[PDB]
Amino acid sequence: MLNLENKTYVIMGIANKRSIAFGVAKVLDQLGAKLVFTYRKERSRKELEKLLEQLNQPEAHLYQIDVQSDEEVINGFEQIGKDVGNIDGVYHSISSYSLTIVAHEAKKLMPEGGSIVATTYKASLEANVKYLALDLGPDNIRVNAISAGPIRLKEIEERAPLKRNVDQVEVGKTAAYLLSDLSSGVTGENIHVDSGFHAI
Amino acid sequence: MLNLENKTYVIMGIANKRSIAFGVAKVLDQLGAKLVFTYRKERSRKELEKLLEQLNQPEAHLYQIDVQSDEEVINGFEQIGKDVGNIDGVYHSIISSYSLTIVAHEAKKLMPEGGSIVATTYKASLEANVKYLALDLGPDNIRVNAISAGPIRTFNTILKEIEERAPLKRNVDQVEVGKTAAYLLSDLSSGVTGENIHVDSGFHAIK
Amino acid sequence: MLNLENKTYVIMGIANKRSIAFGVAKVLDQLGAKLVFTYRKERSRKELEKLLEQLNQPEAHLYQIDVQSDEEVINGFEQIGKDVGNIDGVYHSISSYSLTIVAHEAKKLMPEGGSIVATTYKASLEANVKYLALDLGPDNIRVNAISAGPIRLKEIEERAPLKRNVDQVEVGKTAAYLLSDLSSGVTGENIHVDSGFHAI
Amino acid sequence: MLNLENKTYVIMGIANKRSIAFGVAKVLDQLGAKLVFTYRKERSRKELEKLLEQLNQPEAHLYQIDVQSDEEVINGFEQIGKDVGNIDGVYHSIISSYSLTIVAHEAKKLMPEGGSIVATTYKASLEANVKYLALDLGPDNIRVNAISAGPIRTFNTILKEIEERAPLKRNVDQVEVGKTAAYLLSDLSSGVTGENIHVDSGFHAIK
């Protein structure tokens, strides 16, 4: 059914056509979701512009955010803030928090609430996903971590129980479980979209 | 538009309008899935083929299954084999990880192209089979993942802590657990196996 | 210097001469520590009796405790309780807690305080070591987990950075860091006496 | 009776009577160990070869070490090489994990039979080198493990939370951190490497 379109998400994290975060765009384009992107380099917008039709229709609300810049992400979101509206949720990508930040700037457009999904892909963990889950919970806000095996290695293929490995687009889809309503009871959580490897 | 309706699943452990598992059928019923039940004491029949006001229309396929004897799990699942014939996964709800294991292996037979199995609870080592059995069937492409429902109505003080200290300041219900489980049997869980999902308002991340 | 003798510990966990928990006895005999043992089977006291000189001198305060028996460990400790005195700390050994229990029965002879050390040796964790650490903390009580690689395999030997693996007696000694005062600031903690393997 | 006095270690980062690291020497001094210092700004000399009222009697061997340039870590440790000559481990106290790394590799040269290295803090990925460097030297038998001191006097509100909500209801000091570190360079830590030890009153296990 459920949980989809018109709703707004800002995939911050795309480097090019193989970025997990294009997976997430891609899937998310597809369910009807309006969608925002941010960007580190001047130019990867060189690319992201091409990156489309694909059906999210302008601009698309590219904004460039470098993410170690308190003050960049700030008129980053303030920028967007005033541009789109407020937002349905965010897709985040040593060692990191920029998320803490990303996230407390993000809070203040999601006023009815939302969701935030951030993707590791040793020895991050996985745990101001918990904290920040504490925090905005009361705000009716969800913070969850997807943590992806590798795409695209050859020990997993043998020891990971699904006898293969993942890609972007299946990471895309756990992402939209996470962004979706299907998951409304859920937070402070981390999903391994890693074929099972994490089991062993 | 999307993912995988059409498909057929055994849900296993509905006692009434309120058994977590029920929400698993409801929601499921709701996505066009096709649905089989099992049921332990069939005064759980007594409700169950009530109404069904579902959209599942046969039949149901209720099956009596006494989850502690191997031989009518063994028979359950063949009977099932003859009737509708063949499957997409199993929502297993309701120590008794034997059920899971032995459930888990015969469900295997119904699945020649693979699938998905979900087991619910409400200590973790559910999480500890979900995970051995996730290796065991993984080579036959079947995922298996646990879910773990925090409490709803079915304790009283423990009821209320979680409203004041679940992040989300409240609690979950059967259709919240139902929704997620749909994510599990689903293809959108496509890459996931031997995982545990707290549908717990947050409460898994504190003190 | 420090942290040693006369102080009383009850190595619950010895099955025979190769039990980690004999390691701990062994080491602990050696620093001057008075020492108590418990036992599952009738008979492993068959063995433990032999298990000695070795210098802890009577009885030694064997008591048999089966550890899924609320009421066994109770006159288990009540038994000892009245026999030795109160105690300096405990050495504990699906999936377990008996420790929770072990531990809240143990509390009430350690009144000035102590320490409790419990040893796992996938997918235990490691975490009512935390809780129970919460609990008795205020009681000036320490709860810590040692988690041992294998003794006595041949993938560790290659991938564990110390290019070998452990034994009992080195597990013995982390144990007496844990039982010792050297560690007085420490609790809710877990030490891998696993050659490094846990790193990788 | 026991473990391994006799031995010789570089302690590296004493600013005064109160620098965590100091307690590392004190305690260490106390077990009969032999002790070398480094010190960044030597108005940290100004205190340091004060008294020493230690039992270390030469000399000390203070060494000026500016922890951000490789070439006088490089020189530090050779100078050290010529003087006392050769070693048992290094207490490294005081981003600047470069220090550790580059410290860590040259300390390697002083150790032909192996040893022990401890690095202190007070985010974790200290824990993340302690651990790469624990692999890297592990084949040369050198362990490396981090410690992580919760706060003492050297913040004010954060001072007091931990007294009310460290399990142990209070806080640690320099000789508590000192004691543990002795456990690290020690042989009683014999099996341990690439680990992190909270000397934190408990505070690592909550909220």
PDB file of C-alpha atoms in Angstrom, chain C:
ATOM      1  CA  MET C   1      51.964  -5.005  45.508  1.00  0.00           C
ATOM      2  CA  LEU C   2      48.515  -5.101  45.865  1.00  0.00           C
ATOM      3  CA  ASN C   3      45.171  -6.681  46.149  1.00  0.00           C
ATOM      4  CA  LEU C   4      45.306 -10.271  47.438  1.00  0.00           C
ATOM      5  CA  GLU C   5      45.308 -12.429  50.323  1.00  0.00           C
ATOM      6  CA  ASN C   6      43.035 -13.463  52.946  1.00  0.00           C
ATOM      7  CA  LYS C   7      40.442 -12.033  50.761  1.00  0.00           C
ATOM      8  CA  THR C   8      37.801 -14.462  49.875  1.00  0.00           C
ATOM      9  CA  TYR C   9      36.647 -15.707  46.552  1.00  0.00           C
ATOM     10  CA  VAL C  10      34.392 -18.552  45.590  1.00  0.00           C
ATOM     11  CA  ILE C  11      35.375 -20.038  42.236  1.00  0.00           C
ATOM     12  CA  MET C  12      32.309 -21.402  41.293  1.00  0.00           C
ATOM     13  CA  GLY C  13      32.874 -23.146  37.933  1.00  0.00           C
ATOM     14  CA  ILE C  14      35.596 -25.867  38.249  1.00  0.00           C
ATOM     15  CA  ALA C  15      34.714 -28.934  36.371  1.00  0.00           C
ATOM     16  CA  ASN C  16      38.259 -30.710  36.550  1.00  0.00           C
ATOM     17  CA  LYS C  17      42.057 -29.876  36.225  1.00  0.00           C
ATOM     18  CA  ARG C  18      41.582 -28.147  32.862  1.00  0.00           C
ATOM     19  CA  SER C  19      38.715 -25.938  33.803  1.00  0.00           C
ATOM     20  CA  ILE C  20      39.560 -22.196  33.201  1.00  0.00           C
ATOM     21  CA  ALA C  21      38.294 -21.916  36.704  1.00  0.00           C
ATOM     22  CA  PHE C  22      41.005 -24.122  37.976  1.00  0.00           C
ATOM     23  CA  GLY C  23      43.256 -21.665  36.235  1.00  0.00           C
ATOM     24  CA  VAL C  24      41.780 -19.078  38.514  1.00  0.00           C
ATOM     25  CA  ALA C  25      42.128 -21.051  41.730  1.00  0.00           C
ATOM     26  CA  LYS C  26      45.572 -21.901  40.746  1.00  0.00           C
ATOM     27  CA  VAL C  27      46.737 -18.263  40.433  1.00  0.00           C
ATOM     28  CA  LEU C  28      44.552 -17.136  43.174  1.00  0.00           C
ATOM     29  CA  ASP C  29      45.783 -19.896  45.454  1.00  0.00           C
ATOM     30  CA  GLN C  30      49.063 -18.437  44.736  1.00  0.00           C
ATOM     31  CA  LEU C  31      48.474 -14.763  45.789  1.00  0.00           C
ATOM     32  CA  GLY C  32      47.200 -15.783  49.192  1.00  0.00           C
ATOM     33  CA  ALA C  33      43.571 -15.641  48.547  1.00  0.00           C
ATOM     34  CA  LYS C  34      41.116 -17.561  50.363  1.00  0.00           C
ATOM     35  CA  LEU C  35      39.031 -19.255  48.133  1.00  0.00           C
ATOM     36  CA  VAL C  36      35.708 -21.151  47.946  1.00  0.00           C
ATOM     37  CA  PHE C  37      34.319 -23.647  45.357  1.00  0.00           C
ATOM     38  CA  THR C  38      31.232 -24.761  44.253  1.00  0.00           C
ATOM     39  CA  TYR C  39      30.331 -27.754  42.081  1.00  0.00           C
ATOM     40  CA  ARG C  40      27.595 -29.221  39.916  1.00  0.00           C
ATOM     41  CA  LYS C  41      28.149 -32.909  40.211  1.00  0.00           C
ATOM     42  CA  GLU C  42      28.650 -35.080  43.297  1.00  0.00           C
ATOM     43  CA  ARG C  43      31.834 -36.122  42.323  1.00  0.00           C
ATOM     44  CA  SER C  44      33.646 -33.515  40.563  1.00  0.00           C
ATOM     45  CA  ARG C  45      34.348 -33.156  44.279  1.00  0.00           C
ATOM     46  CA  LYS C  46      35.450 -36.462  43.901  1.00  0.00           C
ATOM     47  CA  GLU C  47      38.070 -34.454  42.094  1.00  0.00           C
ATOM     48  CA  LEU C  48      38.356 -31.087  43.572  1.00  0.00           C
ATOM     49  CA  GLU C  49      39.333 -32.721  46.881  1.00  0.00           C
ATOM     50  CA  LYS C  50      42.470 -34.008  45.195  1.00  0.00           C
ATOM     51  CA  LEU C  51      42.509 -30.448  43.867  1.00  0.00           C
ATOM     52  CA  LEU C  52      44.833 -28.836  46.257  1.00  0.00           C
ATOM     53  CA  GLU C  53      47.685 -28.792  48.295  1.00  0.00           C
ATOM     54  CA  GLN C  54      47.597 -25.918  46.766  1.00  0.00           C
ATOM     55  CA  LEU C  55      47.774 -24.240  49.748  1.00  0.00           C
ATOM     56  CA  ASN C  56      44.279 -22.997  50.432  1.00  0.00           C
ATOM     57  CA  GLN C  57      44.034 -25.336  53.478  1.00  0.00           C
ATOM     58  CA  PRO C  58      40.475 -26.383  54.345  1.00  0.00           C
ATOM     59  CA  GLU C  59      37.926 -27.467  53.722  1.00  0.00           C
ATOM     60  CA  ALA C  60      37.943 -26.152  51.120  1.00  0.00           C
ATOM     61  CA  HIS C  61      34.538 -25.017  51.743  1.00  0.00           C
ATOM     62  CA  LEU C  62      33.202 -27.082  48.940  1.00  0.00           C
ATOM     63  CA  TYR C  63      29.585 -26.618  48.448  1.00  0.00           C
ATOM     64  CA  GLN C  64      27.769 -27.967  45.500  1.00  0.00           C
ATOM     65  CA  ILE C  65      25.548 -25.670  43.688  1.00  0.00           C
ATOM     66  CA  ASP C  66      23.868 -26.663  40.533  1.00  0.00           C
ATOM     67  CA  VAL C  67      22.990 -23.243  39.197  1.00  0.00           C
ATOM     68  CA  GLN C  68      19.506 -23.515  37.836  1.00  0.00           C
ATOM     69  CA  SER C  69      18.060 -23.704  41.322  1.00  0.00           C
ATOM     70  CA  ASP C  70      17.026 -20.624  42.891  1.00  0.00           C
ATOM     71  CA  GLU C  71      16.823 -22.601  46.073  1.00  0.00           C
ATOM     72  CA  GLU C  72      20.130 -24.447  45.671  1.00  0.00           C
ATOM     73  CA  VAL C  73      22.374 -21.403  45.339  1.00  0.00           C
ATOM     74  CA  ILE C  74      20.524 -19.798  48.114  1.00  0.00           C
ATOM     75  CA  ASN C  75      21.461 -22.213  51.022  1.00  0.00           C
ATOM     76  CA  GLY C  76      24.400 -22.455  48.768  1.00  0.00           C
ATOM     77  CA  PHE C  77      25.576 -19.183  49.732  1.00  0.00           C
ATOM     78  CA  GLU C  78      23.607 -19.185  53.020  1.00  0.00           C
ATOM     79  CA  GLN C  79      25.352 -22.357  53.673  1.00  0.00           C
ATOM     80  CA  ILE C  80      28.868 -20.817  53.064  1.00  0.00           C
ATOM     81  CA  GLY C  81      27.593 -17.659  54.342  1.00  0.00           C
ATOM     82  CA  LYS C  82      27.493 -18.969  57.878  1.00  0.00           C
ATOM     83  CA  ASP C  83      30.649 -21.129  57.296  1.00  0.00           C
ATOM     84  CA  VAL C  84      33.372 -18.826  56.003  1.00  0.00           C
ATOM     85  CA  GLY C  85      32.122 -15.425  56.763  1.00  0.00           C
ATOM     86  CA  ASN C  86      31.139 -12.990  54.095  1.00  0.00           C
ATOM     87  CA  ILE C  87      33.154 -12.892  50.996  1.00  0.00           C
ATOM     88  CA  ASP C  88      35.538 -10.764  48.880  1.00  0.00           C
ATOM     89  CA  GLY C  89      34.096 -11.605  45.490  1.00  0.00           C
ATOM     90  CA  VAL C  90      32.971 -14.348  43.230  1.00  0.00           C
ATOM     91  CA  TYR C  91      34.185 -16.095  40.114  1.00  0.00           C
ATOM     92  CA  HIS C  92      31.310 -17.143  37.950  1.00  0.00           C
ATOM     93  CA  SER C  93      31.479 -19.369  34.907  1.00  0.00           C
ATOM     94  CA  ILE C  94      21.461 -21.062  27.129  1.00  0.00           C
ATOM     95  CA  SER C  95      22.888 -18.771  27.766  1.00  0.00           C
ATOM     96  CA  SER C  96      23.440 -17.625  30.806  1.00  0.00           C
ATOM     97  CA  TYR C  97      22.088 -15.792  33.624  1.00  0.00           C
ATOM     98  CA  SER C  98      22.489 -17.710  36.752  1.00  0.00           C
ATOM     99  CA  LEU C  99      24.566 -14.840  37.541  1.00  0.00           C
ATOM    100  CA  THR C 100      21.820 -12.492  38.087  1.00  0.00           C
ATOM    101  CA  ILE C 101      20.793 -14.889  40.691  1.00  0.00           C
ATOM    102  CA  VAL C 102      24.218 -15.999  41.739  1.00  0.00           C
ATOM    103  CA  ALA C 103      24.828 -12.385  42.135  1.00  0.00           C
ATOM    104  CA  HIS C 104      21.995 -11.098  44.055  1.00  0.00           C
ATOM    105  CA  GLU C 105      22.511 -13.885  46.514  1.00  0.00           C
ATOM    106  CA  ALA C 106      26.233 -13.016  46.628  1.00  0.00           C
ATOM    107  CA  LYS C 107      25.526  -9.322  47.329  1.00  0.00           C
ATOM    108  CA  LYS C 108      24.447  -9.923  50.828  1.00  0.00           C
ATOM    109  CA  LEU C 109      27.821 -11.122  52.166  1.00  0.00           C
ATOM    110  CA  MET C 110      29.879  -8.580  50.453  1.00  0.00           C
ATOM    111  CA  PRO C 111      28.789  -5.607  52.642  1.00  0.00           C
ATOM    112  CA  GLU C 112      31.888  -3.455  52.359  1.00  0.00           C
ATOM    113  CA  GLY C 113      31.812  -4.584  48.751  1.00  0.00           C
ATOM    114  CA  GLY C 114      33.665  -6.643  46.173  1.00  0.00           C
ATOM    115  CA  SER C 115      33.762  -7.921  42.737  1.00  0.00           C
ATOM    116  CA  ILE C 116      32.304 -10.676  40.537  1.00  0.00           C
ATOM    117  CA  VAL C 117      33.847 -11.913  37.542  1.00  0.00           C
ATOM    118  CA  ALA C 118      32.017 -14.162  35.057  1.00  0.00           C
ATOM    119  CA  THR C 119      33.486 -15.762  31.957  1.00  0.00           C
ATOM    120  CA  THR C 120      31.851 -16.509  28.736  1.00  0.00           C
ATOM    121  CA  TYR C 121      33.977 -18.511  26.579  1.00  0.00           C
ATOM    122  CA  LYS C 122      28.512 -15.881  18.583  1.00  0.00           C
ATOM    123  CA  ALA C 123      26.634 -14.792  20.795  1.00  0.00           C
ATOM    124  CA  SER C 124      26.474 -14.240  24.344  1.00  0.00           C
ATOM    125  CA  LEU C 125      26.903 -10.850  25.538  1.00  0.00           C
ATOM    126  CA  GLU C 126      27.601  -9.389  27.955  1.00  0.00           C
ATOM    127  CA  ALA C 127      25.047  -7.226  29.379  1.00  0.00           C
ATOM    128  CA  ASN C 128      23.562  -8.158  32.510  1.00  0.00           C
ATOM    129  CA  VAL C 129      27.059  -7.695  33.279  1.00  0.00           C
ATOM    130  CA  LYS C 130      26.157  -4.038  32.555  1.00  0.00           C
ATOM    131  CA  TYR C 131      22.780  -4.140  34.363  1.00  0.00           C
ATOM    132  CA  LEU C 132      23.982  -5.886  37.281  1.00  0.00           C
ATOM    133  CA  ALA C 133      26.826  -3.515  37.237  1.00  0.00           C
ATOM    134  CA  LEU C 134      24.111  -0.598  37.641  1.00  0.00           C
ATOM    135  CA  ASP C 135      22.632  -2.201  40.472  1.00  0.00           C
ATOM    136  CA  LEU C 136      25.122  -3.083  43.035  1.00  0.00           C
ATOM    137  CA  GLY C 137      27.398  -0.317  41.904  1.00  0.00           C
ATOM    138  CA  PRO C 138      26.020   1.894  44.467  1.00  0.00           C
ATOM    139  CA  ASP C 139      26.742  -1.026  46.784  1.00  0.00           C
ATOM    140  CA  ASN C 140      30.340  -0.483  45.911  1.00  0.00           C
ATOM    141  CA  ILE C 141      30.093  -3.687  43.887  1.00  0.00           C
ATOM    142  CA  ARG C 142      31.830  -4.682  40.697  1.00  0.00           C
ATOM    143  CA  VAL C 143      30.569  -6.680  37.957  1.00  0.00           C
ATOM    144  CA  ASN C 144      32.781  -7.658  35.107  1.00  0.00           C
ATOM    145  CA  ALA C 145      32.974 -10.146  32.342  1.00  0.00           C
ATOM    146  CA  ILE C 146      36.076 -11.886  30.990  1.00  0.00           C
ATOM    147  CA  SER C 147      35.478 -13.407  27.647  1.00  0.00           C
ATOM    148  CA  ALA C 148      38.108 -16.125  26.640  1.00  0.00           C
ATOM    149  CA  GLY C 149      39.059 -17.448  23.311  1.00  0.00           C
ATOM    150  CA  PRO C 150      39.573 -21.091  23.205  1.00  0.00           C
ATOM    151  CA  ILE C 151      42.161 -23.047  24.941  1.00  0.00           C
ATOM    152  CA  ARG C 152      43.877 -26.156  23.674  1.00  0.00           C
ATOM    153  CA  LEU C 153      41.731 -23.060  16.948  1.00  0.00           C
ATOM    154  CA  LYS C 154      44.095 -23.215  14.160  1.00  0.00           C
ATOM    155  CA  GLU C 155      42.615 -20.285  12.409  1.00  0.00           C
ATOM    156  CA  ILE C 156      43.169 -18.115  15.417  1.00  0.00           C
ATOM    157  CA  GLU C 157      46.667 -19.298  15.608  1.00  0.00           C
ATOM    158  CA  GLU C 158      47.003 -17.578  12.164  1.00  0.00           C
ATOM    159  CA  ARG C 159      44.642 -14.598  12.318  1.00  0.00           C
ATOM    160  CA  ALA C 160      44.742 -13.580  15.979  1.00  0.00           C
ATOM    161  CA  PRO C 161      47.400 -11.062  16.215  1.00  0.00           C
ATOM    162  CA  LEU C 162      49.358 -12.712  18.955  1.00  0.00           C
ATOM    163  CA  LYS C 163      49.730 -15.708  16.569  1.00  0.00           C
ATOM    164  CA  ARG C 164      48.802 -18.201  19.226  1.00  0.00           C
ATOM    165  CA  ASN C 165      45.990 -18.715  21.683  1.00  0.00           C
ATOM    166  CA  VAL C 166      45.418 -18.473  25.428  1.00  0.00           C
ATOM    167  CA  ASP C 167      45.187 -20.568  28.273  1.00  0.00           C
ATOM    168  CA  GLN C 168      43.598 -21.135  31.638  1.00  0.00           C
ATOM    169  CA  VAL C 169      46.406 -19.563  33.515  1.00  0.00           C
ATOM    170  CA  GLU C 170      46.408 -16.326  31.669  1.00  0.00           C
ATOM    171  CA  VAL C 171      42.726 -16.266  32.042  1.00  0.00           C
ATOM    172  CA  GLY C 172      43.450 -16.884  35.679  1.00  0.00           C
ATOM    173  CA  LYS C 173      45.470 -13.793  35.750  1.00  0.00           C
ATOM    174  CA  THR C 174      43.061 -11.415  34.020  1.00  0.00           C
ATOM    175  CA  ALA C 175      40.586 -12.760  36.594  1.00  0.00           C
ATOM    176  CA  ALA C 176      42.688 -11.705  39.429  1.00  0.00           C
ATOM    177  CA  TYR C 177      43.136  -8.183  37.802  1.00  0.00           C
ATOM    178  CA  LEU C 178      39.368  -8.228  37.950  1.00  0.00           C
ATOM    179  CA  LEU C 179      39.084  -9.611  41.473  1.00  0.00           C
ATOM    180  CA  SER C 180      42.141  -7.483  42.458  1.00  0.00           C
ATOM    181  CA  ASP C 181      42.076  -3.832  43.623  1.00  0.00           C
ATOM    182  CA  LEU C 182      44.148  -2.870  40.620  1.00  0.00           C
ATOM    183  CA  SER C 183      40.849  -2.375  38.880  1.00  0.00           C
ATOM    184  CA  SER C 184      38.980  -0.437  41.460  1.00  0.00           C
ATOM    185  CA  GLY C 185      37.615   2.086  39.054  1.00  0.00           C
ATOM    186  CA  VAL C 186      36.287  -0.496  36.872  1.00  0.00           C
ATOM    187  CA  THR C 187      32.943  -2.128  36.199  1.00  0.00           C
ATOM    188  CA  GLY C 188      30.328  -3.044  33.747  1.00  0.00           C
ATOM    189  CA  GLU C 189      33.322  -4.081  31.787  1.00  0.00           C
ATOM    190  CA  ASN C 190      34.421  -7.121  29.631  1.00  0.00           C
ATOM    191  CA  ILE C 191      37.961  -8.087  28.886  1.00  0.00           C
ATOM    192  CA  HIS C 192      38.887 -10.247  26.072  1.00  0.00           C
ATOM    193  CA  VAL C 193      41.500 -12.572  27.114  1.00  0.00           C
ATOM    194  CA  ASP C 194      41.380 -13.875  23.560  1.00  0.00           C
ATOM    195  CA  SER C 195      44.831 -12.935  22.013  1.00  0.00           C
ATOM    196  CA  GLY C 196      43.339  -9.963  20.186  1.00  0.00           C
ATOM    197  CA  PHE C 197      41.025 -11.970  18.166  1.00  0.00           C
ATOM    198  CA  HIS C 198      38.119  -9.882  19.033  1.00  0.00           C
ATOM    199  CA  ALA C 199      39.765  -7.063  16.923  1.00  0.00           C
ATOM    200  CA  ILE C 200      39.029  -8.544  13.488  1.00  0.00           C
TER     201      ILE C 200
END
